[PDB]
Design a protein around this ligand. Structure first.
Ligand SMILES: *[C@@H]1O[C@H](CO)[C@@H](O[C@@H]2O[C@H](CO)[C@@H](O[C@@H]3O[C@H](CO[C@H]4O[C@H](CO)[C@@H](O)[C@H](O)[C@@H]4O)[C@@H](O)[C@H](O[C@H]4O[C@H](CO)[C@@H](O)[C@H](O)[C@@H]4O[C@H]4O[C@H](CO)[C@@H](O)[C@H](O)[C@@H]4O[C@H]4O[C@H](CO)[C@@H](O)[C@H](O)[C@@H]4O)[C@@H]3O)[C@H](O)[C@H]2NC(C)=O)[C@H](O)[C@H]1NC(C)=O
Ligand SMILES: *[C@@H]1O[C@H](CO)[C@@H](O[C@@H]2O[C@H](CO)[C@@H](O[C@@H]3O[C@H](CO[C@H]4O[C@H](CO)[C@@H](O)[C@H](O)[C@@H]4O)[C@@H](O)[C@H](O[C@H]4O[C@H](CO)[C@@H](O)[C@H](O)[C@@H]4O[C@H]4O[C@H](CO)[C@@H](O)[C@H](O)[C@@H]4O[C@H]4O[C@H](CO)[C@@H](O)[C@H](O)[C@@H]4O)[C@@H]3O)[C@H](O)[C@H]2NC(C)=O)[C@H](O)[C@H]1NC(C)=O
Ligand SMILES: *[C@@H]1O[C@H](CO)[C@@H](O[C@@H]2O[C@H](CO)[C@@H](O)[C@H](O)[C@H]2NC(C)=O)[C@H](O)[C@H]1NC(C)=O
Ligand SMILES: *[C@@H]1O[C@H](CO)[C@@H](O[C@@H]2O[C@H](CO)[C@@H](O)[C@H](O)[C@H]2NC(C)=O)[C@H](O)[C@H]1NC(C)=O
Ligand SMILES: CC(=O)N[C@@H]1[C@@H](O)[C@H](O)[C@@H](CO)O[C@H]1O
Ligand SMILES: CC(=O)N[C@@H]1[C@@H](O)[C@H](O)[C@@H](CO)O[C@H]1O
Ligand SMILES: CC(=O)N[C@@H]1[C@@H](O)[C@H](O)[C@@H](CO)O[C@H]1O
Ligand SMILES: *[C@@H]1O[C@H](CO)[C@@H](O)[C@H](O)[C@H]1NC(C)=O
Ligand SMILES: *[C@@H]1O[C@H](CO)[C@@H](O)[C@H](O)[C@H]1NC(C)=O
Ligand SMILES: *[C@@H]1O[C@H](CO)[C@@H](O)[C@H](O)[C@H]1NC(C)=O
Ligand SMILES: *[C@@H]1O[C@H](CO)[C@@H](O)[C@H](O)[C@H]1NC(C)=O
Ligand SMILES: *[C@@H]1O[C@H](CO)[C@@H](O)[C@H](O)[C@H]1NC(C)=O
Ligand SMILES: *[C@@H]1O[C@H](CO)[C@@H](O)[C@H](O)[C@H]1NC(C)=O
Lengths: 394, 393
């Protein structure tokens, strides 16, 4: 009795699997996006198995594999995309069923977790969703927004990009606390117009600090709207897509047709450098109308953003996808870029804070040990965007 | 609708896995178990200790931890939680239980609180932390697993019951290795009150997720902290040997002013024996048989140790790094141990590579290593066999 030793475990320092979303990505294939506890030492094979349980008890086994697109180190959890693919539509009949997932600890699979990842009710399967035409031409997948964010910037970003991507475009935001009541009011005209979706992901709080927030959202957004549009764009609300003179959005995407994804080089802008000029009413100018100074360094590599055809994507990361079918284009510099106003969206008050002489229009200005040049490309569109906003939401 | 849900499933790593909670003195306790390490989150304190007495009151204790194993490569790390009070929280002997809080990190507010141990009213007996103690020496064995040979256990128990004398006890930890054959070999010693075979077969739930040997040494350390003057740590394929001119009492007297000392190794072949028909190897014991010692010089070799548990807080598998007092390694002339590597899990006759009688005086190269003749243990076989028949029959 006393020599019958017992090992009493307490607490749960890491779940095996945390599901954020589960989506059908075609007549034949599904994706489960979430978090996983990585194995240590013990060999884990398989990580998962997928089954479809039709509503009359019959089960069809699926070919399952996973992708771990985040850094892989430094956090309790790693973002995981579980790809379940069947030989035929397991719900071809449309009688309904359930995609079930098995999650394993080690190859000595005594213990495992089985759960329903999603249910399709009888008659709800709809093959016309994976056939053209799709809901939108373009879809913006937003980052996870947290902190003290400026409503005025959201107002200006939405107006600019609602114009940039045209009427057949939708915008998906992920609210992790950053969407203030004031930011929400800025998005409200577009929400009410059916153009913007604001997802509440404030329930992620109990996991904050235990995984990489941006890698989860990009992959969930990738599969939640996999067939909603033809091109999914990934960038932040302090970043503005721009087409150099002599290009349309349809022109550039047509030149990029035969590529599954393409990257977009950055035009880094100062969020503080403005002209010393009592002529200008900076409190009444928009961000990209005021911040006209671009860091001028040549031949230095900077962070990039990207657009992707989710049809041919299985997972993705923050700056591009590593899990696609098809080619990847990077030579995009002459035809599409994005202006980046770093550390602008969290700034209260006037963004204009370091004021330069009018001499700086034609000379190189040194600020924070970096060279800058005048660039008014975006300021030239401020008038066009403001009319568009008035003509679209009043 | 758009209110996203995060559905968690499973438990891939508990926060704390207790194996044993122990009173280490009038003022202090220890909780030995496993812990999940924090990953990029600040965890401080890891634990808090509280004594809820049957009197009603509740006194907090100073709590600190020790992580004596490698600290990486496994889901869990072995932990010894040390709870010390300014006064015996049960001087009243009114009873009470030692509560232990375990925390995930500073960010999260809730934690895990459980009963590490409970002391019924009138069970505390201070005289158990003062001499005389139950035994003079105690042996703390390893986690026993695999297909183990019962004949080796019998030879080992017979030798070390003689080596350590009558006031000695032997603690074995059965994690699967104590077959019915092995158990029968130990049964004469168990029935005589000289050996304890703990059942730690419940360890299989966590097999592969922590360092087996590090957990057992630390639970044995505190489980029998004041049971003996000295606690010896080594395996059943290892035999403590005293170069002639030294007795156990003699050596331990020279070492008294040291809290622990390490013991160098004499590596033996578990396969090499003489090509000699006058030898009846099926009727010879292991150390009576395997007479060839690996002879390389200046080579870093594993060591074993003995420790005065009363002044130890945690330990490892080759020595402790959490003690008060000196540590001694210059022991090479006075005490050693013969190590018969990969012998215990071998079925059948150990003698398997047979050498000419010439090998008594030359170096023998086997598997690329040099070996020499060494009959120091064989000389004692008759003594051990006489002691066995005169002790267990
Ligand atoms: C889980 O993982 C599994 C894999 O482990 C995923 O399943 C894979 O998904 C892939 C993407 O959906 C899929 O690849 C696509 O298959 C389509 C169907 O092809 C069928 O026919 C061919 C024979 O012709 C068969 O061999 C094949 O097996 C199928 O039966 C193809 O149509 C797709 O091809 C297009 O993209 C590739 C990528 O480079 C091109 O090479 C190809 O030429 C096609 O390119 C056209 O379309 C792209 C845009 O998609 C344009 O950029 C390009 O310029 C072409 O555009 C013209 O043509 C289209 C019409 O096709 C037209 O609309 C357009 O306007 C232009 O005129 C592609 O090959 C894999 O087969 C599939 N694998 C398996 C085993 O199932 C699963 O999705 C994952 N699940 C989740 C949830 O992530
Ligand atoms: C949790 O953690 C806490 C703290 O982190 C742990 O608490 C600490 O535990 C220590 C070890 O148990 C303890 O230290 C010991 O205290 C003993 C009692 O001290 C009382 O007596 C001394 C006088 O002897 C007073 O000064 C003191 O104020 C107390 O009243 C001491 O007896 C121990 O001293 C001996 O060991 C040290 C370390 O080597 C020597 O330096 C010292 O000289 C003593 O050495 C003699 O004994 C050892 C064997 O014990 C011999 O090796 C040595 O050669 C000497 O032997 C002669 O003398 C002894 C007399 O005992 C005689 O029997 C023998 O035959 C020889 O003639 C030691 O110092 C800390 O005080 C204590 N701290 C606190 C804050 O509580 C707690 O244990 C942890 N919990 C668990 C479960 O692990
Ligand atoms: C997404 O792209 C597809 C493929 O380019 C579009 O479908 C094609 O549209 C053109 C022009 O209307 C037709 O000539 C082709 O026959 C269509 N192809 C197929 C396979 O149907 C589709 O219109 C785009 N989706 C949206 C919402 O604009
Ligand atoms: C544990 O060690 C102590 C310290 O040497 C032993 O107690 C001493 O024994 C001698 C000889 O009998 C006495 O003269 C001393 O007075 C004892 N010391 C104390 C503090 O009482 C003790 O015998 C050892 N334990 C066992 C079981 O042998
Ligand atoms: C909804 C559903 O799957 N119904 C099943 C069908 O798939 C299967 O082929 C058949 C054989 O058991 O039984 C019925
Ligand atoms: C019954 C049903 O939902 N049918 C849908 C319908 O909305 C449309 O014809 C197409 C694209 O949305 O998908 C299908
Ligand atoms: C830099 C700034 O904020 N304000 C300056 C002011 O300091 C300066 O006296 C004036 C010169 O005409 O130009 C403006
Ligand atoms: C939001 O504001 C508070 C105080 O104004 C600040 O402590 C907090 O850090 C801000 N959020 C972020 C993400 O910086
Ligand atoms: C279109 O993309 C495919 C990759 O799926 C590639 O093999 C093919 O060469 C591309 N077509 C052209 C004209 O480059
Ligand atoms: C609990 O025991 C302690 C120690 O004797 C004492 O100080 C305290 O008064 C006791 N509590 C009660 C409620 O009597
Ligand atoms: C115990 O024996 C069985 C077969 O006899 C074997 O499969 C197993 O591996 C053995 N144990 C070890 C530790 O080798
Ligand atoms: C052992 O002894 C026998 C009998 O002398 C001999 O035939 C044999 O070659 C010796 N060596 C080995 C390896 O068996
Ligand atoms: C006895 O041990 C103490 C440490 O507890 C040490 O300071 C002292 O030097 C030792 N005695 C001798 C003679 O080395």
């Amino acid at each position: 009795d006393p020599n019958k030793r017992i090992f009493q475990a307490y607490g749960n320092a890491a779940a095996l699997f945390v599901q954020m979303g589960a989506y059908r990505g075609g007549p034949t294939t599904f994706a489960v996006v979430g978090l996983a506890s990585k194995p240590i030492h013990v060999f884990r094979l398989p990580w998962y198995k997928c089954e479809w349980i039709s509503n009359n008890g019959s089960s069809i086994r699926a070919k399952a594999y996973k992708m771990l697109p985040d850094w892989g180190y430094g956090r309790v959890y790693t973002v995981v995309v579980v790809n379940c693919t069947f030989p035929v539509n397991p719900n071809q009949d449309n009688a309904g069923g359930r995609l079930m997932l098995n999650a394993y600890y080690d190859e000595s699979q005594r213990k495992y977790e089985k759960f329903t990842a999603l249910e399709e009710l009888p008659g709800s399967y709809n093959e016309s969703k994976f056939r053209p035409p799709y809901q939108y031409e373009y879809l913006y997948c937003g980052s996870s927004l947290y902190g003290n964010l400026s409503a005025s910037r959201f107002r200006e970003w939405m107006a600019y990009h609602a114009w940039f991507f045209g009427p057949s475009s939708h915008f998906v935001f992920h609210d992790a606390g950053g969407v203030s009541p004031e930011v929400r009011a800025a998005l409200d005209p577009w929400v009410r117009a059916g153009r913007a979706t604001v997802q509440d992901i404030r329930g992620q709080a109990e996991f904050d600090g235990y995984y990489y927030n941006q890698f989860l959202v990009v992959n969930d957004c990738l599969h939640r709207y996999r067939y909603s549009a033809n091109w999914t764009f990934y960038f932040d609300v302090d970043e503005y897509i721009y087409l150099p003179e002599g290009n349309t959005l349809e022109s550039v995407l047509k030149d990029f047709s035969n590529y599954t994804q393409f990257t977009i080089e950055q035009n880094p802008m100062s969020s503080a450098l403005c002209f010393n000029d009592s002529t200008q009413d900076y409190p009444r100018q928009w961000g990209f109308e005021k911040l006209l100074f671009r860091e001028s360094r040549t031949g230095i590599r900077r962070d990039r953003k990207y657009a992707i055809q989710a049809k041919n994507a299985y997972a993705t990361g923050v700056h591009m996808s590593e899990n696609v079918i098809g080619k990847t284009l990077h030579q995009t510099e002459t035809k599409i870029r994005y202006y980046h106003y770093h550390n602008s969206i969290q700034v209260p008050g006037e963004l204009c804070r370091e004021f330069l002489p009018l001499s700086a229009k034609n000379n190189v200005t040194w600020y924070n040990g970096l060279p800058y040049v005048y660039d008014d490309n975006m300021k030239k569109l401020a008038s066009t965007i403001k009319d568009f906003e008035r003509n679209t939401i009043g």
